[PDB]
Design an enzyme around this catalytic site. Structure first.
Site, short mmCIF file in Angstrom:
data_model
loop_
_atom_site.label_atom_id
_atom_site.label_comp_id
_atom_site.label_asym_id
_atom_site.label_seq_id
_atom_site.Cartn_x
_atom_site.Cartn_y
_atom_site.Cartn_z
N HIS A 1 90.44 52.51 61.78
CA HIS A 1 89.29 53.29 61.68
C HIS A 1 88.44 53.21 63.04
O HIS A 1 87.60 53.98 63.35
CB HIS A 1 88.51 53.18 60.41
CG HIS A 1 87.62 52.02 60.62
ND1 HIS A 1 87.91 50.75 59.54
CD2 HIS A 1 86.39 51.60 61.01
CE1 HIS A 1 87.21 49.80 59.83
NE2 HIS A 1 86.06 50.47 60.72
N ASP B 1 94.51 51.28 56.72
CA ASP B 1 93.65 50.84 57.86
C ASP B 1 94.16 49.83 58.74
O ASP B 1 93.63 48.70 58.46
CB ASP B 1 92.20 50.43 57.33
CG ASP B 1 91.05 50.70 58.11
OD1 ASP B 1 91.40 51.36 59.51
OD2 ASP B 1 89.98 50.35 57.98
N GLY C 1 80.96 45.49 62.02
CA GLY C 1 81.15 45.02 63.54
C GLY C 1 82.21 43.89 63.50
O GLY C 1 82.73 43.63 64.60
N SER D 1 85.06 44.76 61.65
CA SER D 1 86.31 45.37 61.38
C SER D 1 87.44 45.16 62.41
O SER D 1 87.15 45.14 63.75
CB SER D 1 86.06 47.00 61.20
OG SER D 1 85.24 47.22 60.10
N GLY D 2 88.45 44.88 61.98
CA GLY D 2 89.71 44.90 62.96
C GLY D 2 90.28 43.32 62.94
O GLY D 2 91.09 42.98 63.47
O1 LIG Z 1 83.61 57.21 62.50
C1 LIG Z 1 84.57 56.72 62.31
N1 LIG Z 1 85.13 55.59 62.97
C2 LIG Z 1 84.07 55.14 64.10
C3 LIG Z 1 83.91 53.49 63.92
C4 LIG Z 1 84.48 52.64 64.96
C5 LIG Z 1 84.02 51.07 64.82
C6 LIG Z 1 83.47 50.87 63.51
C7 LIG Z 1 83.10 51.79 62.66
N2 LIG Z 1 82.17 51.30 61.56
N3 LIG Z 1 81.63 51.84 60.92
C8 LIG Z 1 80.86 50.82 59.67
C9 LIG Z 1 81.64 50.20 59.74
C10 LIG Z 1 82.05 49.04 58.97
C11 LIG Z 1 81.23 48.86 57.75
C12 LIG Z 1 81.51 47.50 56.97
C13 LIG Z 1 81.25 46.72 55.93
N4 LIG Z 1 81.94 45.56 55.79
C14 LIG Z 1 82.86 45.04 56.43
N5 LIG Z 1 83.31 45.85 57.46
C15 LIG Z 1 82.67 47.11 57.92
N6 LIG Z 1 82.75 47.88 59.14
C16 LIG Z 1 82.78 50.26 60.94
O2 LIG Z 1 83.73 49.22 61.21
C17 LIG Z 1 83.18 53.24 62.82
N7 LIG Z 1 85.43 57.25 61.55
C18 LIG Z 1 84.86 58.35 60.49
C19 LIG Z 1 85.58 59.36 60.57
C20 LIG Z 1 85.34 60.57 59.68
C21 LIG Z 1 84.24 60.40 58.94
C22 LIG Z 1 83.53 59.26 59.13
C23 LIG Z 1 83.76 58.46 59.82
#
Ligand SMILES: O=C(NCc1cccc(-n2ncc(-c3cc4cncnc4[nH]3)c2O)c1)Nc1ccccc1
Ligand SMILES: [Ca+2]
Ligand SMILES: [Cl-]
Lengths: 57, 247
Positions: free
Chosen positions: B41, B90, B184, B186-187
């Site tokens: 993602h 993911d 922040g 993620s991954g």
């Molecule tokens: O927008 C994107 N991708 C971009 C993109 C890049 C890099 C980080 C993130 N990103 N945003 C939120 C979080 C995140 C909340 C969270 C809570 N607890 C643990 N880990 C977490 N991570 C996160 O990692 C998104 N996709 C998309 C496609 C289609 C529709 C909507 C969204």
């Protein structure tokens, strides 16, 4: 055997036909004569923390 | 990471920081000198695939200490089954343009055999999750790499203790809102110790952050071992993004 106690293997375990089992080691490791233990063969094997390994050397 | 501590410099040597246009994007895990595992993602919105950077040996974002190693990302491989903006499948496999140099501060995490991971690792209660993510829900990100010990739940138990988990996921952490991975992070790695060695068992995905009544969700790496291994044996293809069949 492998499904239990990891077949006694430190790392990877393969089942064989019979009451047979073979342990294996990740790249950067070698299997000891005990047939279970893995020892590093390189300076920086995976999944070890040098500053901690040294702290214990 | 919420409710953790600073990972002492060099104690998380497999941790990767991903940057896009110099900005923090996501975490990752080094598994070999040229391969990094992250979350699909992270790449949903990438415009210029050419501006993706992986940093190894990172610790304190505020300073340069010379243990840092930066590489361009040459390839981002994602499973065919992954749908952008969702949670299932993911996972991403990243090929670096040039290998990193293994040092005291840069070391790969072992990618385990499936069987071993399934039969053994999956039953190790506690594992470590790390990143430079938010220290709090709706809070600032960390300047120093943070780490958190989290317990894994069987999916049945997860669902019961919760107040859509697939076979490609697992739950870990706490429901009391004190401790979690966060935006922040993620991954990043979910790393599991067994008999003196650490292995990759999970990838920080998304969803909330230290939300009461909820558990952290992680990509179940064991489901992907064979997929990853095959890819790592394959020749690079032109174009950064590659969608690869899964299984
Ligand atoms: O927008 C994107 N991708 C971009 C993109 C890049 C890099 C980080 C993130 N990103 N945003 C939120 C979080 C995140 C909340 C969270 C809570 N607890 C643990 N880990 C977490 N991570 C996160 O990692 C998104 N996709 C998309 C496609 C289609 C529709 C909507 C969204
Ligand atoms: Ca630094
Ligand atoms: Cl491209």
């Amino acid at each position: 055997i492998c499904v239990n106690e990891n077949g006694g293997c430190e790392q990877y375990c393969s089942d064989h036909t019979g009451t047979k089992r073979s342990c294996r080691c990740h790249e950067g490791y070698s299997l000891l004569a005990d047939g279970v233990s893995c020892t590093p063969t390189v300076e920086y094997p995976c999944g070890k923390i040098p500053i901690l390994e040294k702290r214990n050397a | 990471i919420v409710g953790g501590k600073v990972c002492p410099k060099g104690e998380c040597p497999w941790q990767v920081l991903l940057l896009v246009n110099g900005a923090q994007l996501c975490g990752g895990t080094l598994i070999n000198t040229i391969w990094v595992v992250s979350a699909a993602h992270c790449f949903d919105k990438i415009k210029n695939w050419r501006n993706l950077i992986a940093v190894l040996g990172e610790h304190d974002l505020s300073e340069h200490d010379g243990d840092e190693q930066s590489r361009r990302v040459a390839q981002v491989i994602i499973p065919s089954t992954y749908v952008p903006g969702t949670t299932n499948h993911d996972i991403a496999l990243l090929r670096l343009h040039q290998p990193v140099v293994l040092t005291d501060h840069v070391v790969p995490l072992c990618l385990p055999e499936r069987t071993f991971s399934e039969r053994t690792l999956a039953f190790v209660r506690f594992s470590l999750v790390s990143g430079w993510g938010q220290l709090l829900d709706r809070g600032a990100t960390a300047l120093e790499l943070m780490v958190l010990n989290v317990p894994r739940l069987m999916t049945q138990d997860c669902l019961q203790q919760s107040r859509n988990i697939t076979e490609y996921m697992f739950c870990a952490g706490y429901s009391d809102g004190s401790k979690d991975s966060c935006k922040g992070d993620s991954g990043g790695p979910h790393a599991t110790h067994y008999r003196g060695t650490w292995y990759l068992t999970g990838i920080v995905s998304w969803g909330g952050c230290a939300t009461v009544g909820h558990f952290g969700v992680y990509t179940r790496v064991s489901q992907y071992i064979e997929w990853l291994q095959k890819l790592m044996r394959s020749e690079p293809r032109p174009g950064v993004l590659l969608r690869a069949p899964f299984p």
